[PDB]
Amino acid sequence: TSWSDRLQNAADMPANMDKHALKKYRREAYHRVFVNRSLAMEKIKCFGFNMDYTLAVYKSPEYESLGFELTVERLVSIGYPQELLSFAYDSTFPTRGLVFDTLYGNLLKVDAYGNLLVCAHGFNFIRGPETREQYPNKFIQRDDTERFYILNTLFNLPETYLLACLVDFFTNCPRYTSCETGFKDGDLFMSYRSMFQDVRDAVDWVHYKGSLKEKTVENLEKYVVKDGKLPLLLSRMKEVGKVFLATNSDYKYTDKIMTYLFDFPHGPKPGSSHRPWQSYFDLILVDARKPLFFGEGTVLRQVDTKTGKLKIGTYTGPLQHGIVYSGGSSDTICDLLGAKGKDILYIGDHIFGDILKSKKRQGWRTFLVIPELAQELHVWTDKSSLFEELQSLDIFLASSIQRRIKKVTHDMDMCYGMMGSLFRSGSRQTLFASQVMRYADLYAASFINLLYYPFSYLFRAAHVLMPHES
Amino acid sequence: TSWSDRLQNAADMPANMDKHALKKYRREAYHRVFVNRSLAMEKIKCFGFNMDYTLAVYKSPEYESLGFELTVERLVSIGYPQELLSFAYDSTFPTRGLVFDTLYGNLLKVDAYGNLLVCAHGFNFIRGPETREQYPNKFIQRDDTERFYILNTLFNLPETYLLACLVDFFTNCPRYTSCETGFKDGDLFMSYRSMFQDVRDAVDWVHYKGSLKEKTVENLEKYVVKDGKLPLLLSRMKEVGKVFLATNSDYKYTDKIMTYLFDFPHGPKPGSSHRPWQSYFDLILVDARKPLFFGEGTVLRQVDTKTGKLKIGTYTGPLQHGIVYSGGSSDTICDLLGAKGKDILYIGDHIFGDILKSKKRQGWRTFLVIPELAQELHVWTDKSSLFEELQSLDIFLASSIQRRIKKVTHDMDMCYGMMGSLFRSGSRQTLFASQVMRYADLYAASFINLLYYPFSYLFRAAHVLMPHES
Amino acid sequence: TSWSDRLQNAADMPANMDKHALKKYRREAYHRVFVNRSLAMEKIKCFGFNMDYTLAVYKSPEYESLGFELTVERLVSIGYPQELLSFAYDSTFPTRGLVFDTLYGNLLKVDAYGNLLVCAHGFNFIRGPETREQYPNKFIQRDDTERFYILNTLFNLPETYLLACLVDFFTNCPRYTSCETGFKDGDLFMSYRSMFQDVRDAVDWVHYKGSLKEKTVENLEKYVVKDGKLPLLLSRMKEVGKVFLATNSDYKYTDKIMTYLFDFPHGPKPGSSHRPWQSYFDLILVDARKPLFFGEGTVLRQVDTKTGKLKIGTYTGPLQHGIVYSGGSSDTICDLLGAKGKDILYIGDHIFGDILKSKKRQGWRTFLVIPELAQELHVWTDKSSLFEELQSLDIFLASSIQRRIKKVTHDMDMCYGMMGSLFRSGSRQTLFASQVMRYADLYAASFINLLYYPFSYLFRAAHVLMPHES
Amino acid sequence: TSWSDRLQNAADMPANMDKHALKKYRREAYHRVFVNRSLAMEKIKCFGFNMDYTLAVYKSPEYESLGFELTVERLVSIGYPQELLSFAYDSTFPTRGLVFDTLYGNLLKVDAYGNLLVCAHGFNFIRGPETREQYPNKFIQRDDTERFYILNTLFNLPETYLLACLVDFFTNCPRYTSCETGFKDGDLFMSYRSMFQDVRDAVDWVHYKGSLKEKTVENLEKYVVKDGKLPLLLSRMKEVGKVFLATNSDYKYTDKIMTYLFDFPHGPKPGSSHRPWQSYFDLILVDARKPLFFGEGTVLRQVDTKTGKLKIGTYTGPLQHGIVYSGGSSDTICDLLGAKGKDILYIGDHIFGDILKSKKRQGWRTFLVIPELAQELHVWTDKSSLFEELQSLDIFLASSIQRRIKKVTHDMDMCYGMMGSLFRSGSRQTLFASQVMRYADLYAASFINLLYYPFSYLFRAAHVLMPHES
Numbered sequence A, B, C, D: 001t002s003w004s005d006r007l008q009n010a011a012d013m014p015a016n017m018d019k020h021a022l023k024k025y026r027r028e029a030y031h032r033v034f035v036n037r038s039l040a041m042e043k044i045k046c047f048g049f050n051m052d053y054t055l056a057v058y059k060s061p062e063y064e065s066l067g068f069e070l071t072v073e074r075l076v077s078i079g080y081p082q083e084l085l086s087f088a089y090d091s092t093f094p095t096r097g098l099v100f101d102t103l104y105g106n107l108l109k110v111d112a113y114g115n116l117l118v119c120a121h122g123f124n125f126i127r128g129p130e131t132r133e134q135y136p137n138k139f140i141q142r143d144d145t146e147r148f149y150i151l152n153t154l155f156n157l158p159e160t161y162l163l164a165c166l167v168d169f170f171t172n173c174p175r176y177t178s179c180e181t182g183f184k185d186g187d188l189f190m191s192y193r194s195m196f197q198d199v200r201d202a203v204d205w206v207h208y209k210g211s212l213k214e215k216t217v218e219n220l221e222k223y224v225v226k227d228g229k230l231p232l233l234l235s236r237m238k239e240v241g242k243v244f245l246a247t248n249s250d251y252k253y254t255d256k257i258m259t260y261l262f263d264f265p266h267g268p269k270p271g272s273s274h275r276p277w278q279s280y281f282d283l284i285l286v287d288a289r290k291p292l293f294f295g296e297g298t299v300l301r302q303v304d305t306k307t308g309k310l311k312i313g314t315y316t317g318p319l320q321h322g323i324v325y326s327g328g329s330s331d332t333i334c335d336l337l338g339a340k341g342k343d344i345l346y347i348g349d350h351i352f353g354d355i356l357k358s359k360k361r362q363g364w365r366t367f368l369v370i371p372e373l374a375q376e377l378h379v380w381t382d383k384s385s386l387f388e389e390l391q392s393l394d395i396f397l398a399s400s401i402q403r404r405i406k407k408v409t410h411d412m413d414m415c416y417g418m419m420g421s422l423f424r425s426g427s428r429q430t431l432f433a434s435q436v437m438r439y440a441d442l443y444a445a446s447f448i449n450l451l452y453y454p455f456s457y458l459f460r461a462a463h464v465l466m467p468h469e470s
């Protein structure tokens, strides 16, 4: 039961909009909206959506596997060894938000301070003493962005696993000699950094020039979660405000995906006429180039929606019915919809490119969709006893207790996968957790959980106090 | 009773090192060390100190007044109007950590998200609706560092007030015409940005080329807090670890100040021989150029301590008794003392240049000295009823209640000064508060509060949980 | 009779290597090597060649037409109007080395000082007084590289003409309104700068992703000059030194072109066994990325010559027989061939990327191939009377004489084409001429002209004197 | 007889403005204006002057000695050894336009291509074979501006000599160990680069914060050439055009110097009333910050001429009688005087900051003052036989002749000083010569030589032809 199985199971249910039914549903953690900072929904005038992994949640592990396969086949086609074709995606290895160290070829799970929580070289998990050889303070400098790459999105799960597969392969293959910073193959030296760049290039190629989109669109039921409740929620938002779409994707792909997401024999509710996806939006913007979008952006263009090509020239005209925009900046949306940032709730999945940048650069209100939460909640509850033990041990710690804390931390972590919870390693929160708490005003397993709250709901978080104020 | 009066009152007391006396003393908030993240003192192998506003706490308002006076006289000497000589420092206006907006000439108190809490143009406090003309989302982009300058240190209190005095002066003087971005004086236009730069240049000049240091050193009892307990604490730290000094100041000034701080007819305790200040340190480093120090640094130099001049050439030798270093990098300290970052507790007052940068760049443990805490605690306790009311109102808020929340927030804020608490405006925490909580492992009114805790004390903070984990 | 007709006519002749025949041949300007700075051929130890427009001279106007056609079809395919398909390359318009002004959409012919010699907006040649509206000092700032683009190579002849065709089209088409910096089409604005970028992108696409190379290789006799004397010259150079190839092209294309250039039923001379092209070179380097090549370069790679793919990893091994390199830097060649810069004569066609950068960055000796010289010499001689008149007029000028100087300048210029000689407009030398004289030690219509000089020839230029030294 | 002796001898003569006397005077090379590119004086509408080493020519070797002495005393005061006080300026060593190599500590005389003509380490002249160890291609990369510093001005003559004195001192002093990139003194390493930076800093300090200006102004007759013909020439220029002053100097110093330059008991000619220096200028601009002046410049300020301080604010008003400007850009002059660049003849001494940048950035007409020309002409003529021999030898060279060419080159060079002619080493022209020919339209020993030519004089240079055009 993957997180996307949980999501599709919930997707297959019709909405019971009886107000008592809604209150009862949102009791369940799965259907809840979690609150980092208070947000009065009556003050939101524009609801903004991202597409991929927000509206269009790709099914797991099928979509990751497909990405993995195509990225492997691209590497082989440019000259990587044929043994790469023996690799097979394993959803139990990667956790999102890991850092690849391009100097030493390690996947790292770190906290917000750059402290090491987990270190794996290939499939070899390095324990604390051994890690001190490469990380003498058990710490990385996060500002060293040329060395350390943060794998933020669900699109990065395939490369996360592939990176580990490659280090494992070259390490254990007798044709190569391992060195601290890469592999020697005769008179050829491949650094981890250049291997990393090849992988990153190959993922990019698969998305831009390869067959990922085509294979996705030819089997949408296999690859994409579909929910009859989507048009219902959007239709309700449009009753109280404006709705916009802002995607890094191109129009032709957006049209195919959004068409699919709205393909039911009805509109917002059963019995209602079907309406085109575009009718649900006051503004549609593709090729957004987030996060640059939230700074200078790019020139505003108009899509010719018949051909799917951009019209030539910068678009200088007003918001018109049926117009589809490309490029621009966050200021385009604000100006055309007449919103200030705090009037906007932007709903996305990319912690950096959607949430952190819209919050910090523009003061937008933010909702982070965390698809894995669906399953992480089930584990958090089913295994709460292990965490409770860990909490008690940590308290009792103010020895053999310390080795028990390590053992329990490991047993807890393993319940999530080889790289542990997205949110923590035992009692230490991850960088991803700290960025969620800091930048995501709201978060949930799915944006659809907003359907279960009334229009004027006040989401509340407790006021924060400093230690000297308590 | 300024914060420095509180600090000197505590300074005049001898240490009662009876273990029961110590436990009882550190009960009081004034004498307490506050904990943002847990820290096991037994793991600290090096204690590092900054000098100014850490070891050498300048008396208030006398030292700010002196800085103010000299900065005014420098501006007048370069051509500013004679009416500046009518200005007189007012300690009731500035709060630390304000942002000067160089485009519109406002002092702003903001939260961690760039949200406006207070906006003053000269001495005119702008209420929310009027602020929307210049700040349509009631928000600033903190990454716009060319526009917004954060006044982080107690050294910035004089310019904070002076900035306000100048905008007030030019606004109300009929020789000048006010414009949105500065003042017209015939065929001369002075932008707020160029005025700001003149002030910043004049403060720098006063410190580097003017008479501030000379006037300070000629009346140290007037300007500098002195505490017999300093050598006691340092002597105790040296029993369990190494002690270093890292200052942005030059050696000649450092020597005069540190000599004064240790000038008692005894050493660590009464009855003991006096020892030179330098004997308390394993490493002394001046001209540190923090925060660059925590990145590339500068070339390591050796001070000729007889002349106070640098020896010519980069110093390539070992740590030797009596050597005094200049420049270098944080890696100099680590290498010469054989420490990794987590073995170091660095004690400073500059939230950015001491604490944030040593934490983020090097994974040092951090202790922030907040001199105003001495007095902010007295107000926090004496006026807790106003905050309690505010908390209750906010709860009751889930109208005339909303105007009561504004009124109570104001009455609370005014107890601290015209720009409110360093840490908050009513229930909204400031940027400075959020940076203290994030980057300062420990904090206190004075580093001396460490004397009241044993060598192997475990400072504990509660583990943090996400909303879905609670 | 295009310049390439002249070149192929000379190419079809067998080499008469009788020493008296050689001396007599190189009398003719067409077969001569011209000398800007003295060069002792006996000191040259390595001869380096570029491929395109050096060894492989593309036939004119056929190859330019093909590039033009494909670039047009790419623009149409991305959304440019169908009327572009009515354009047809005209070899009589463009001269090499023009500057496109992206702000005002003009093609400019300038001198070394940025002084305007010719200005055309579309096909409208702007006379001096009108040009002062846009160029008040009749001058451009050459350091404004974001505004001004120099069209240096024969590869740029198609876009030179296309730029003019486009400005002409949009200016005279009633669907568009002309503005100073581009064209309005309703709510779309297309700036000259964005049009220019579209053209540049489309040329790049044609070369990298389109069909130019494929269509070239399927009719090499149509598109490429072939000369039986090439292997003879290279074979002779290899007798006295080392020979290398350095191309910006990829290996697969290089192999197809070089195979063709050497496809005769003999080797160096008639009667000799044919040898593969690669046997003529001590070092072969593709994907050179000139001019970056002459600075940091890129990582040195090894080509797998069976597949045409790069081997994975940086190549760290020695120069080996049969190895083909990719990337690297000019230092690669020096190190592997054991040459210092002054031991190298590098033969190329790109005034900036081959000649200026190798001279300035590395102190290489330089030979510039100027394919149009073949025909420019015929005009220079056939019409010397017009220039002679101009010279006399200029002398007599120290009025109606001044209008005669303009008239004669024009009549002279028109003999070369609408944009005049590559080297001058009347008596004013072009930027391209000044760069040839400054950076090209030697130059000629073809590198083959080196066959007509002995191994130890001393090419001499007169020593230069300052005005006060004469 | 220094060049400044020659200049003052000519300065002491009254102007005979009889038209036949003028024609005859300008026959002599000393009194001639030399022409690199033709210039019609009737088209010049604005004459622009620099002050230092243009209008105010400092006497040699007295002024260089003074600069040298003060720079030495500054180095000693910051900690350099006392033996520096034994140094004494020697005018026979430095030639202008040398390059200091900060990596290896050599003074280099180079051509326009970075080819080595002379290399001295301290006072040791390194002959060709030995130089190949450090300069394997006998070449430097001029674009490596962090490594190579060009000593362009007469202000750089003292540091040129001092650099050589220092390398000599540390090399031969047994306290220091010489290394390839600097000197070891125990645990101190001083790199040539850091020594160079100390010298550059000390020269800057002497000019900005030391006593150079004060000592100059207290003995102007000792340090500054004065010429009664200056007001005559300026008065004549003002009859046919506008006259401006643009100096990097401050107003107070400019006023003292310009007052002195005009201090005669008469105005333009004997018998005429004396007029203040400022009356000779339509525009006076100080603190020009050339060459930044010819790009973005700085904010335009107004000088308060009573106090010598800048008025506060950017000056936004018109050109007014008596106004003195500070900062700004070259566009300030153009706009306020209503000139385009080709209407301006700018007269200066700094080949880079005055001449090259005004030519390339703005298309100004340029006149370079070369004070040493006064004496270099006397040597060029007196020793023409040596050059003639060299020319003949070079011809005869197309061996013992080659060693004769080296010997004659040396004997010729030594007539100018240890570092040879400014303009050449034997038959090879220097970088400075090539920049003079390229960027200086006109040049002369003194700007005063313009007095000897009529208002509408056409300065002519021969049209340049390429080798294939001859």
Ligand SMILES: Nc1ncnc2c1ncn2[C@@H]1O[C@H](COP(=O)(O)OP(=O)(O)OP(=O)(O)O)[C@@H](O)[C@H]1O
Binding pocket: A112, A142, A143, A144, A145, A150, A152, A351, A352, A435, B360
């Ligand atoms: N999740 C992420 N993915 C990619 N880049 C990131 C992410 N988070 C931060 N960055 C960027 O990485 C760079 C270095 O991060 P650094 O730790 O110095 O800053 P920070 O994110 O502000 O740290 P903190 O989380 O302590 O506020 C910055 O440019 C930052 O914007």
Ligand SMILES: Nc1ncnc2c1ncn2[C@@H]1O[C@H](COP(=O)(O)OP(=O)(O)OP(=O)(O)O)[C@@H](O)[C@H]1O
Binding pocket: C360, D112, D142, D143, D144, D145, D150, D152, D351, D352, D435
């Ligand atoms: N006389 C000088 N003094 C200081 N800087 C100079 C001088 N002449 C050129 N430069 C600068 O030095 C840098 C490197 O010079 P480089 O040889 O690459 O360019 P260049 O001067 O254009 O050469 P060329 O003389 O061949 O035209 C450039 O930024 C250039 O402007």
Ligand SMILES: O=c1[nH]cnc2c1ncn2[C@@H]1O[C@H](COP(=O)(O)O)[C@@H](O)[C@H]1O
Binding pocket: A050, A051, A052, A053, A155, A203, A204, A205, A207, A208, A246, A247, A248, A249, A250, A253, A290
């Ligand atoms: O790593 C990547 N390389 C290239 N494209 C990516 C990558 N990750 C996501 N994308 C693309 O980004 C788009 C998702 O944009 P979204 O709708 O804004 O979430 C899709 O078109 C993806 O193909």
Ligand SMILES: O=c1[nH]cnc2c1ncn2[C@@H]1O[C@H](COP(=O)(O)O)[C@@H](O)[C@H]1O
Binding pocket: B050, B051, B052, B053, B155, B203, B204, B205, B207, B208, B246, B247, B248, B249, B250, B253, B290
């Ligand atoms: O704004 C400033 N301008 C110039 N110097 C400053 C400023 N603020 C602090 N300083 C100097 O910084 C030094 C303080 O360094 P610390 O010991 O590292 O805290 C003192 O020498 C101050 O004079």
Ligand SMILES: O=c1[nH]cnc2c1ncn2[C@@H]1O[C@H](COP(=O)(O)O)[C@@H](O)[C@H]1O
Binding pocket: C050, C051, C052, C053, C155, C203, C204, C205, C207, C208, C246, C247, C248, C249, C250, C253, C290
């Ligand atoms: O404008 C261009 N855009 C893209 N490729 C170009 C352009 N001009 C030349 N080239 C390519 O550069 C290569 C020529 O390299 P050369 O052998 O070094 O002259 C050929 O592969 C061309 O296709």
Ligand SMILES: O=c1[nH]cnc2c1ncn2[C@@H]1O[C@H](COP(=O)(O)O)[C@@H](O)[C@H]1O
Binding pocket: D050, D051, D052, D053, D155, D203, D204, D205, D207, D208, D246, D247, D248, D249, D250, D253, D290
């Ligand atoms: O190397 C230097 N360092 C500092 N000032 C210099 C240097 N060289 C020249 N100057 C100053 O530049 C000014 C000369 O400007 P000019 O009138 O534009 O030639 C004088 O004030 C000099 O003091």
Ligand SMILES: [Mg+2]
Binding pocket: A050, A051, A052, A053, A054, A348, A349, A350
């Ligand atoms: Mg997304």
Ligand SMILES: [Mg+2]
Binding pocket: B050, B051, B052, B053, B054, B348, B349, B350
């Ligand atoms: Mg401090």
Ligand SMILES: [Mg+2]
Binding pocket: C050, C051, C052, C053, C054, C348, C349, C350
């Ligand atoms: Mg080429």
Ligand SMILES: [Mg+2]
Binding pocket: D050, D051, D052, D053, D054, D348, D349, D350
């Ligand atoms: Mg000067």
